[model samples]
Target chain A: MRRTVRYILATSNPMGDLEALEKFVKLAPDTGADAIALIGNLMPKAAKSRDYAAFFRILSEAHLPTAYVPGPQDAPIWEYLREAANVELVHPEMRNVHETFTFWRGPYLVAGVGGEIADEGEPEEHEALRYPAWVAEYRLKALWELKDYPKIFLFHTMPYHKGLNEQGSHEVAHLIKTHNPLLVLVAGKGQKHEMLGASWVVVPGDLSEGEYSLLDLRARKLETGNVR
Target chain B: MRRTVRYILATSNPMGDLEALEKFVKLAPDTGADAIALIGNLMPKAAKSRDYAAFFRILSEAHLPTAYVPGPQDAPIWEYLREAANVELVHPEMRNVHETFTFWRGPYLVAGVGGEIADEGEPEEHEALRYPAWVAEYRLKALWELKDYPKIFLFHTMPYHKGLNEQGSHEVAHLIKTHNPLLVLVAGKGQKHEMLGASWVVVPGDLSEGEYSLLDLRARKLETGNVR
Candidate 1:
């Protein structure tokens, strides 16, 4: 007998395409996607949360809890998603996130590192959720320590790979290699499957460009979806 | 002609050999040694700082600046090292240490990671000057950012290698490979001059065991000295 189908709807750079995400969430439950991972770049730079209440409301009503990893254009809007189908924002400290590493569905742990990692300079703390590539190490290790279950790690910036000009952070690859996250979803653009150590680093097609993916962990397969 | 003979007397696991270190210091300047790097495991468990004022006083008078990195038996003695010819303990904050990355000599930046890193666990801060392997990454990167000068990194634990059971910290080798510090000094036992990334990871023979090494940066050579 085939195992129960477990999947997550994944997208990147939504850039405020509510209609696409609306049509997208409509397909979640029916297609076995228990959770939606907005890998990041969800907001158009100039947009605010109020402009998308209808979008957040529909998501809340649909009940497909979403994991939001902040992209460059993303703002601090954790409180804004209070009633939405949002998994509450959990700021991971380097030690305790292991026991409390919970998210939308069963057996799937979601953890993320937000904003771009500046490859040069000392470890810095930005005003918002941004983190320096050096400091990002601890946060990633926090996720890595919780090896009780497989994890889907979200990164706003891609791990450092030669030739990905605007897409990689040198420090980010260390954790992926060590932790072996099942999938490292990147908001930045890249070819679908690149390996960082043992983990498969994938950049789902951009949602703003009418693209998304469904990850079937059981089959280790990613199926795509388009909205236009 | 010799290049002015700049050297730092290095030793690990002093384990309270103040009398030996005192006799050792009398030979320092005579041998052209300008600084002292106590790699770690300095104090024997039964000893305290006050019991060694004669040693600290002589070190203070000699003015051969000392840099201390804590090892397994080390305690919170930054204050204890205040009056000695000590470089003054600079608790690294991961960002600002780059500018203040100074110790006893010119062109030689000194930074250290203290205590044994628990191979597995979340980053932790101990009651004394200790750091977990996860958190030590940032501290190491803080030193790495200062690329202007060659650095001497002191670690109480060795980098994780295929062998070397009680020594390595798996999280350490990342910084060594990326930044290429000239020398990585460890207090833990290891065969001398092991390679970690592009750096030379060395464990100068233990001071408590009547052994030490003088690092000649100009010549890139380590000359051993028998304290007995």
Candidate 2:
């Protein structure tokens, strides 16, 4: 029995502009996706707490179940969203630490990790770089435990050796080796899709500049397109 | 074909005594159970960071898979344990906030939530009384989503009407009603067992005092016994 699940993968650096986010979300339904994956930096520095809240509400209003990973710019947004209850934020915050945020769209199980590893020499101002070594290790352990679930690994940074960006994480690569995820969705450069071993790796760049992918699960196909 | 799995449910208030905890883990294997459940107050005021680290390391040394809920007294322990890498802490800490910590024991899935809703006007000195309202709501939402899994609910406090302790949470009860868990193992008071609707609720009390239960999943029987 063949089943079909349609999804859209989109990343954006909204820079805190609610209008831009609203426009992106307005276009999400056009893909005819059952769910949406918000890869990273959904909000940039110019984004305010209300902007983050309003953005999530818009996703909910679209009636799309979304799973998100926090890009460096997202920590503050989560810190604020942690208190508000208007929308069920699908990202894991510091309070719930090191656990995967998961959801099912038909037969597909989607798992996500938001934070990025910040090495000591990185600039302190880069919030995405603030992700600590312990957290990286913890997340690896968590994902390793979840390896058997047959799911998508969604991250803000690319996995080591899987994408054309300087932000690839070896820990993520370890997850790929152990879990062999069906698909790996990441944000950043290399706005193209490719197959790494048995895993489908896709880089859908920042949505604010209008990059996204429409995925057809049963067909195991991803079509890269721009809303703008 | 029917399969059987055996598990041990134990809760404790080690109160920071490594020697006391060490003694308990050493005794766990005798029950011939596959996994252990550490319910609440697993650490108290007297527990130091090193003690928390040592405590988890011992579980690793025992090579036993464990699920834990942090009692009011458990907050600091996690603060320290979060940085330790000697063991993979199976319990969800601050990440994936508001969801249950889950693991498989053979074919059976076990789920747990640590800490309780500390209502207003409680003493500031009691950490259990400090649970935030949002966390309570979030957990309820999380558990409600998990209701169909046919899993166990482990806790540090009782549902609204199940046990002898003053620490009863309506939110917890809501989880019980919505989930109708197979068995709800708890710490605190009510040192016996009973069936609430379809769920079997047990209060194993403090492990230091040798109180616990041995559950045989396939047999569908729970044996209440002392470890000492």
Candidate 3:
């Protein structure tokens, strides 16, 4: 017997493709995706100042609960999501989201740390990719407390050997090894899959490239999908 | 050439001797001890309601900086210390203390967790003795981030195989092993000392038993001392 949980994994770098994003939001619910993991890069830096509130309004209008994990490009929109009512933005430093562990959809518990974890000597932008020391400390607290629940940890940076967001964090790896999340999701320009110990590491591919994934939680399965 | 850090380690049950606690506070600074680790059981349960404020006031008057790690008996006094301005209470769950990795006095960076870790099937009290799951999680974060600095982890309960607070947590041992703090201190009536890999584990004995220890951080040595 197989169980099923329909979840949409979508990414949108709406910088260039607002039309594609609109198409996916309209079509996603029809595919029976009960919830969404909106891997980010939602708009261009220039667009952020003008369209930040409108972007969330678009998501809220979807009428499906969404978990948004920000990417490096989405950094400017963090506080906006944080202050918005009923928006579930998952990030290590986002106190409200972290306080609740993660957003839950049926049997799936989804939590995440956002941004790239800058590898050593990677550049100034790369340095900010890593979580602040205090935020990383909270990982230990969150993981230990939430260990018993079946969880999925979302990251904007791909795990090492998974995708284009290379130079993953060993500390994050240690977290996976210790707590054993059911799945680990990363978003980048490319798609890949590999297993680190028991966890299924995945990148659903770039939304700008017209990509996403569908996850069946009960059956523990993933299938690729797209807007274009 | 030897460098010395004269610091006092003291634990108080005060089951009967409030006078001794007062005496120790009065004389501790005069002994050339630059700092103090008051490894709790600071007052008898009977005295808590009536004199808790006065007790802390006494210590504050001493003008010697103190690190207070509460024992099983000191559980109820946490909130009081929390509200007391300028009090140094160390516990992972204690938000004020954990906000910074550790307390520093000159070259020493000190951190601690309090209460007894409940042993398996010990009792409800025993279960309460152990830290909540989240509290244990912060240990990994604290140790990992603070690994580069010389640290001392203070506890009200002993590590496994050390003393009366049995059924010690492996989570704690992992912290000590990973961070490799300069010294691990436990406060209890039964005294013991052992090395787990590189960390030095010591219980400075109960203050009611007239016991304390002096740590010379610059020289990296600990010497046993007494109130009497």
Candidate 4:
């Protein structure tokens, strides 16, 4: 038997548009969200501490526990998410974008990687944030080890899908098949819903564009929403 | 606008039961097929020239143009297929399992690699028939170059699908994402029909099990068949 559990999922590029983010967060009260998954570039690259302080306050006051992955432009403000009490930063440790990280969210176990996979042939020493494809594959395999709970995954970048205008990583797609997460939320490109093996890979529209998706774990239904 | 075109797809380990192979080839007289795709292990590991001579005769007498790939167990008789006039062997150059190859089947351009990808940590000197995961990915990327005609692909192995008992290659899965062939037929495991990106990944049952699949390209419909 299953009980109702639903999540409100959203993504934004540094085209962050904070006021737009607020509009949707406020929806948890009406449309309902057991939790919220805020994907990438939640704020602008040049966003200030004051900007994120407001961001965190907005998230907390909304009473939604959040899970977030960092977009490349997000490096500057990821600390705010990490320091925020209501959010879980979901990526491998900095010394190891080559390993997978799992965190508990209510009754869920989620795995993920952050930052863009380095462009083909870029130098290594980048950050705990960036990873080469090989290391990304190595890290995602860790998710295969967790056998309990509803499995979920998050990423700043997504697996390559031509329909998405060729904007994702094959390495990430490879991970989805190997780990078989029940649902994986990727940021950057939105409005994509595909099954990579058994995983439901979702990319909601940009929060700035007033896009988001709702996943009902209890009912196994997904609906894309635009706040406008 | 669309017209009707269909093909019969079959595979066997040799565990290659010749009688079973013959039974399905005879189906062309009733069910109809424009061509046939013979995926892997058409004959047994120790299959002889006469055994293959008979196999080729049966395929030929059925009047079907064939496309075939070598399974790990069928290396001994693959040459017979090459020497036979009715078959096309679809793998990149021997010195380079690192490239992709294409063949014309009516108006369709097909791309593929033969043999299984070498198991991880395995030595690299294996036959051109076998490839390392990296080499396989390199070869498959060539499919991205062909733009004309409806696209199709053939493979001795398939991309990973947990539904297939985890019996395929992630490299192949990665290739399907990158190239996006409209339809790809994989041998060895059967009864799997999936969409990997805009591509259709299909696996029919073993001829040894009296199983096969029919693909009606014109109608974009697929169905599994079994011989009584």
Candidate 5:
């Protein structure tokens, strides 16, 4: 039985066409993708207006809450989330839009930063939204709300981009051990899987199937692995 | 042939005994036993009394300059250096005590810190000095005076202790590679002498002769190591 809620992640490469979305939507439902989230250099200027209109048109026609976040290419998603979908820009946290840990569900949270190049240097410390600063603030907010809730953190840089950005599994491990996020949806090159402990860390093959589900089960009997 | 000005370091493990002093004095002419710097633990309570001179009488009879700094066994090194030596304590750094760097010479600016033990299950962020509130004022004063002369840095904490206190070899190595300090002495277990490239680093051994000398090959080849 398929879950009620779904998520889809649509991503693009440097010079490649935004054809990954089609492939993602097709495969996502099999794993549990509901709606595709597009990030990176997508929406070409020519199709920008039409693509956006068509997205809202589809959501309105189906009466489904199709939410979208802008990546580098998909500036339209940012606008759509901001204006139409009522997807208010949040300070990226370990809550459901904003709620408790055990009660939190996914497709988790999605936000875009930087360009399509994941192999850049460690995100500069002074960058707009530093990982540490965000984590720090988010932790404070979480504590203010509740004591502890598992969080699955999502970020772009992967372990392979070690030399380029110094972002690797070490950092991910550090975050897990340090902040102990519930679920993590890091969008880098890799397979779909779940982190062993506190969170569900999904590194999907298809970026287009942005939809991910954080299905809650009895903690003891939860037979966990890759969500897909 | 030896210089009048010389310096030596002694540990409080077994406490600097007569045999160790005699051996050091016998090792070299300039290296004649001069001063014995005691970690606070070695000193008897009588050492603090002004009227009761038996505590200080040992130095006068031995004809040596004796200064004491406190460690875990004592109150605290910061207080000891300030009150006993009458030398201004600055922000802690780790370098040879005798030589400021390559360009300077003996007994100039010597500062030390007490051992800060790393407690198990404690976070690394708190893995630094625990100043008694008053230390902050002293630290600000020291940072102000840092521009005067490349202030010699000395402290007892090892890199591995509390996870290197964030001063890994790379930070030290960068300074060596750039400024090319005269000498550096690092102790505590697992301190690799290889960290300082070409430059000298002293690793104190049991006999108290563990020292490294930087040879100025450009000048008429003068190798500077242990003073006494």
Candidate 6:
């Protein structure tokens, strides 16, 4: 099957903005993103689950696929996936970094979520921990479980950081020796930056899958006059 | 032995402005960062090697430990290391993303030169790869060499897209499963995120080790402070 599943990954910092989210829903389809990933930390603290559900509902109304991955600040928007029927939790392990659910577009139309295991960071060392540990735990667990897989891995931070090539809190040097993933989708202000071929490929001249998918998404939107 | 070792990493993006680098150097004594890492890609292209050398020389004059890593944009400033004498090359394999150099920081410091190994579309489709066969050859070589590391894996791109992880890039995931490096450094940009205990560590939130270390370098003004 010539499967070309599209996906949108959003990263809301310590807080997510609903107004911004509504705008995102309108924009995502225009961008041709298959789904939207949300970072919780960026959302406003005043926001509640119902508020988030309302946003998801907007996407549902538009028939837009959306996924939520809370950052240090997110308050479990995934819960809405359960409460609301329209929202599909593509990756359950997203609750943890190890098991991430990603929308795939390739020889197969699939979204997967699973990995090893990781525990969340607590508040005590929260003082010491500059970033969230739970997410790191999840990412590591997922990596550990997929050791033999060699082709896949999931992440939370930007391209180089926790998501793909980062070096702040967690050390990623060792993994380079084992699992080598390509096309890592990192959270970027719910936008795109350096990655592979487009935008900001770390090589300075590389491209990004988002660039390809985004381009494809835009072409489709233009065909349908769904311009945002 | 409480050995005091000095090391640094550098990148060129969001590089510390003169002010930021100054703040870093003044506070290095307290932050416990003995060596300065400079983010080179962010440096002004017009800046010559002598300029970099002068900066490092001044840092030496001022009695600060400094190290340098070439950012994606910065030319091979490796000569700057020769100027400083004390600065060590973190990743000996200039182009090899899998190999990383570790510093004897109190807890052992490591730096990886992550670049366009993945995220550039398929090697077959990569515009950067003028030599397709050579690109694939290197890809296989990278995979083979990756299997024999002691600990830590630092990748320039996410893993899995080229090999497996059909849903997304799972390079770190594969590493976690097999070799399981004690620390993984994913480098690039965006978000202050990280995985928990799985051993994959992303740094400075969005920036990777090379980037973070550079921030350290510029911040400390290891050389510029005494260039005169």
- Model 5: per-residue lDDT, tens digit, B1-228? 123224444333212233443443344334343343333232322233231222223333434443333333323222222233222112112121211111123423333333332322221111222332122122222222223433233333333222324554343344334433333344333223333445444433222333323222123132334324
- Candidate with better TM-score, 1 vs 2: 2
**Candidate 5 or 3, higher TM-score:** 3
Give the per-residue lDDT digits (tens) of candidate 6, residues B1-228: 113443333222333244444444454444454444433332344555565554543333212334334343333334333433321111111122223354333333334433334333443211221112234234333444433444444443334432222343344355445444454434345322234344534333222222233223212222112101
lDDT of each: 0.58, 0.58, 0.55, 0.59, 0.32, 0.35
Under the 3 Å rule for N, CA and C atoms, how many clashes does model 5 have?
A: 36
Give the alpha carbon lDDT tens digit for every residue of A1-228 in model 1: 223326767778777788877877777766777566676566655666575455455555446545666555554433222212122222211111211134434566666766656664432222334555544554444343233777778777778765343346667776677678887788754337666666777777788787878887666678887767
Q: Which scores better on DockQ, 2 or 6? A: 2
Tens digits of per-residue lDDT, candidate 3, A1-228, equal 212345655563444366676776787667777766666566554444336556665666566656665556644433333333223232221122221244353465666666554443321122133343234334435344323567777766555544433477666676667667787777666555667878877777777888777766556567777778
Q: Encode model 5's per-residue lDDT on A1-228: one tens digit a residue.
A: 334333433232211232434434444445453433322323442334456545434323322223332233443222323223221112121111211122223433322232222321322211121233233222223222223343334344343322322445454445455655654444444344555356455443323433323223223122122223
DockQ of each: 0.02, 0.16, 0.03, 0.01, 0.01, 0.01
Calculate the i-RMS of every candidate, to one decimal place. 16.6, 5.5, 14.9, 20.9, 24.6, 16.8
Could you list the chain B TM-scores for each candidate? 0.76, 0.76, 0.74, 0.77, 0.42, 0.49
Docking quality category of candidate 1 according to DockQ thresholds:
incorrect
Which sections of candidate 1 miss by over 4 Å?
A1-228, B1-5, B52-55, B77-100, B103-106, B122-130, B161-167, B189-191
**Which candidate leads the pack in DockQ?**
2
Q: Model 1: per-residue lDDT, tens digit, B1-228?
A: 122326777778877778677766777777677667776566654555574444455544445566666565555433233322122222221111211234334556676766666654433222344455445554454343245777777777777765644345567776566667778777744226665655777777787777878887666668887778
Look at candidate 6 and tell me the lDDT of residue A20. Answer: 45
Decoy 4 TM-score against native: 0.43
> For residues B45-67, what per-residue lDDT tens digits would candidate 4 score against the true structure?
66655666567656643434445
Strongest candidate by lDDT: 4
The deviation in Å at residue A29 for candidate 4 is 1.6
In the order shown, the chain A TM-scores of the predictions are 0.76, 0.77, 0.76, 0.77, 0.45, 0.51
Please tell me which predicted candidate would have the highest TM-score against the true structure. 2
Docking class of 2: incorrect
